[PDB]
Design a protein around this ligand. Structure first.
Ligand SMILES: [C]C1=C([C])[C]=C2C(=[C]1)N=[C@]1([C]([C][C]=O)C3=[C][C]=C(Br)[C]=[C]3)C(=O)[N]C(=O)N=C1N2[C][C]([O])[C]([O])[C]([O])[C]OP([O])(=O)OP([O])(=O)O[C][C]1O[C](N2[C]=NC3=C2N=[C]N=C3[N])[C]([O])[C]1[O]
Ligand SMILES: [Zn+2]
Ligand SMILES: [Zn+2]
Ligand SMILES: [Zn+2]
Length: 751
């Protein structure tokens, strides 16, 4: 036969291929062979070692055949001698852990790389074990080759990771389809101790779950950033999935390259490319706020992004969830941030009262709707605090004291949802200019249904239907006659947060205060003018104090944008003003009442809340739901909500008059017994708080969900916008406001 000195592959850069396997007694070593098999520009094996495993009469055949059976039953990747070599025989490479050295070294071929070796390796030391004379030695010349893109081009098979920390979460997938080795026995074997709200990965063919990622498909922004993985995403996916698994395994500390590296176990020079790449992917996912986020804090020179991204200054207007999320992100990235807040406190529509004995009572937000993958649940895990999952039970108690039979509750809910289904059908072919108020469409459909069907409802059934109507006015923050029939539920077209609905028992203020800790926050500093006509943005407060930065982030409430309280120079565009004015500034108010004892326990029997059947439509929304504010059933605090048309009715009532109406309502709801006087209470006035004037946004008649995106659009890469009224997928909530701030910090840090 004819022998060859050179590699089989045209264009391979190895002038002298050497065999890494040396498995056969006739291994060609560094000389001639019938074929030099190419794995990479730095790695080859001779035909004698190929046959050692491949041919049925050679000594390596039993090992190759046993591997082969495991490979083909567990994965979708073809078996071959090359795949076998890369998975089983190619030597490992590891970095010196001396911080001033970090040189790559090849381990001898029988040394199995472990995390422990990757954490403790030093040049010249026996693995798993002097001076530092061996650190000075040059790296093998093949190491530098790996950093070029053409090296990856010439790598014939994608790497497959071993014992990935992501593997227990990915058992429904073929391992090689997510970049993991099919021969790995721990890969192919709820991560215990991981928070059950952390479900980072979609199961196969799954959708409809907010913030899950497909472990087997790259997203578009990943492809824009890493287009070299468009053809074969295997290697990128394994590193991204590993990073997510590690972050959600320990979300209380910054995830760094050095923490990831011992968990990257794969043979060959390609491990060098994997380690170089994991660092780039880490910075990308950090900037996007997918890891290293929440209430994580850093010190100086422990910034989360390298000093490149640091070269900016930012003024943030408003210190609510959105403003503080952006400030925490940007500060952690190493960017200079100043927060200007109009009020004498931080938090915005997060404002907790800590003066009720034994409980924390939000004047503003206190519920989390859907905890799975929710950043609020992440931050609770980081802070070690607990939430209370709501029970389903909610008796509808009538004035006079009767409890509504639950079959009436369900029946009238059935009828109410049927009306919304007709609206859903009616709108399928309607343009924005053909929009109709939801409340008007509902009332029309209902009257037509009574006429057509002839059905006769009791007075109680009609009042219970009014209750279900009031729940939707509560969710929208408005009487439905101002809400768009086309677009009221626009956001439900996107994946929503799954899982538990909870009461944030310790209060969102705990999270707000931790986000803000250590930041440069200026209270009682209402911004009056933002001028971005110069080289730097000029921000002036109402007392004439001037601030300047390269970029500015506006997070003020939608109602304050509608009233134009900040003057912009140049002015906001006509298109931006139309979007701003197409959304509604929804409103609810709250009352909280402390009592000497839990007078409701005998009748309510531990339920988290009870409903209040409205006696007339004129009273829809007036204290419709009462919340028991102690899930441990020890303290006696109720909270109730004023929603819909009821908000206008309490506008000209002072607090004592509201309290009096609420106590008259409670004594009607508990007419058969005595109700004690309250000993402490508050009544909120969000609608007249000058710097807020609302509770949460909704889409007004004629508007579109697209308005949320338009408000979110930056101006000139210089003026950015966040807040709950800028989050199209997740409007209204603390969660969506938080995510909007993280989003804007990502935009700002990219420049
Ligand atoms: C009452 C209430 C309120 C008010 C709110 C809320 C609530 C309540 N809650 C809630 C809701 C949602 C919806 O859905 C609900 C309801 C019911 C149920 Br059953 C469920 C739920 C809850 O609970 N949760 C949540 O999540 N949320 C809520 N809410 C709402 C919230 O709160 C919101 O969203 C947030 O907060 C937002 O955030 P932002 O966006 O950030 O905002 P604020 O907070 O407002 O902040 C802002 C700021 O800014 C300032 N400013 C203005 N202007 C100005 C300023 N500064 C400066 N300068 C100027 N010029 C103000 O002050 C504030 O702070
Ligand atoms: Zn050989
Ligand atoms: Zn080659
Ligand atoms: Zn070294």
């Amino acid at each position: 036969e004819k022998k060859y000195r050179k590699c089989e592959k045209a264009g391979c850069t190895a002038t002298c291929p050497v065999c890494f396997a040396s498995a056969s007694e006739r291994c060609a070593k560094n000389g001639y062979t019938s074929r030099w098999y190419h794995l990479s520009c730095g790695e080859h094996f001779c035909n004698e070692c190929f046959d050692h495993y491949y041919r049925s009469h050679k000594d390596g055949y039993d090992k190759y055949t046993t591997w082969k059976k495991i490979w083909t039953s567990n994965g979708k990747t073809e078996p071959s001698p090359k795949a076998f070599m890369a998975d089983q025989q190619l030597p490992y490479w590891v970095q010196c852990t001396k911080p001033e050295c970090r040189k790559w070294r090849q381990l001898t071929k029988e040394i199995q790389l472990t995390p422990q070796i990757a954490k403790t390796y030093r040049c010249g030391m026996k693995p798993n074990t002097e001076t530092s004379d061996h650190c000075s030695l040059p790296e093998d010349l093949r190491v530098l080759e790996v950093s070029n893109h053409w090296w990856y081009s010439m790598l014939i098979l994608p790497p497959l990771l071993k014992d990935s920390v992501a593997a227990p979460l990915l058992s429904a997938y073929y391992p090689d389809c997510v970049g993991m080795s099919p021969s790995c026995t721990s890969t192919n074997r709820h991560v215990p101790g991981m928070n059950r709200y952390f479900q980072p990965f979609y199961q196969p063919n799954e959708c409809g779950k907010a913030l899950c990622v497909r472990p087997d498909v790259m997203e578009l922004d990943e492809l824009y950033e890493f287009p070299e993985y468009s053809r074969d995403p295997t290697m990128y996916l394994a590193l991204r999935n590993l990073i997510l698994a590690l972050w959600y395994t320990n979300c209380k500390e910054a995830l760094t390259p050095q923490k990831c590296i011992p968990h990257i176990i794969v043979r060959g020079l390609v491990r060098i490319r994997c380690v170089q790449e994991v660092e780039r992917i880490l910075y990308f996912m950090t900037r996007k706020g997918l890891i290293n986020t929440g209430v994580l804090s850093v010190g100086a020179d422990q910034y989360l992004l390298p000093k490149d991204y640091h070269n900016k200054s930012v003024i943030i207007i408003g210190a609510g969830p959105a403003g503080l999320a952006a400030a925490r992100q940007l500060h952690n990235f190493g960017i200079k941030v100043t927060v200007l807040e109009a009020k004498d406190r931080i938090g915005g529509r997060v404002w907790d009262d800590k003066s009720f004995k034994g409980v924390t009572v939000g004047r503003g937000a206190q519920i989390v709707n859907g905890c799975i993958n929710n950043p609020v649940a992440l931050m609770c895990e980081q802070l070690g605090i607990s939430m209370h999952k709501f029970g389903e039970r909610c008796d509808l108690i009538q004035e006079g004291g009767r409890i509504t039979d639950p079959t009436i509750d369900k029946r009238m809910d059935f009828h109410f949802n049927a009306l919304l289904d007709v609206v859903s059908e009616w709108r399928k072919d309607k343009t924005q200019l053909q929009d109709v108020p939801l409340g008007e469409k509902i009332e029309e459909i209902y009257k037509a249904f009574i006429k057509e069907s002839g059905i006769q409802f009791s007075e109680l059934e009609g009042q219970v239907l009014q209750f279900h109507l009031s729940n939707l006015e509560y969710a929208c923050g408005s009487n439905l006659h101002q809400v768009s029939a086309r677009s009221w539920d626009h956001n439900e077209f996107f994946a929503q947060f799954a899982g538990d609905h909870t009461l944030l028992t310790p209060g969102y203020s705990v999270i707000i205060e931790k986000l803000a800790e250590g930041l440069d926050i200026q209270l009682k500093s209402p911004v009056q003018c933002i001028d971005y006509s110069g080289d730097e943005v000029q921000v002036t407060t109402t007392d004439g104090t001037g601030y300047s930065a390269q970029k500015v982030l506006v997070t003020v409430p939608l109602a304050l944008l509608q009233k134009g309280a900040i003057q912009f120079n140049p002015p906001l565009s006509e298109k931006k003003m139309k979007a701003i004015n197409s959304l509604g500034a929804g409103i609810i108010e709250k009352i909280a009442l402390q009592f000497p004892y839990r007078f409701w326990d005998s009748k309510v029997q531990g339920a988290d809340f009870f409903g209040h059947v409205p006696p007339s439509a004129s009273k829809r929304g007036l204290f419709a739901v009462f919340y028991d504010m102690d899930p441990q059933k020890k303290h006696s605090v109720l909270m109730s909500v004023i929603a819909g048309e009821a908000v206008a009715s309490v506008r000209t009532l002072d607090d004592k008059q509201v309290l009096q109406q609420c106590m008259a309502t409670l004594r009607e709801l508990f007419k058969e017994q005595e109700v004690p006087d309250p000993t402490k209470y508050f009544v909120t006035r969000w609608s007249t708080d000058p710097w807020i004037q609302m509770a949460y946004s909704f889409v007004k008649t004629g508007g579109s969900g697209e308005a949320y995106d338009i408000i979110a659009e930056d101006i000139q890469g210089t003026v950015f916008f966040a807040g709950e009224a800028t989050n199209r997928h997740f409007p209204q909530t603390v969660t969506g406001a938080y995510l909007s701030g993280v989003r804007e910090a990502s935009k700002i840090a990219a420049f």
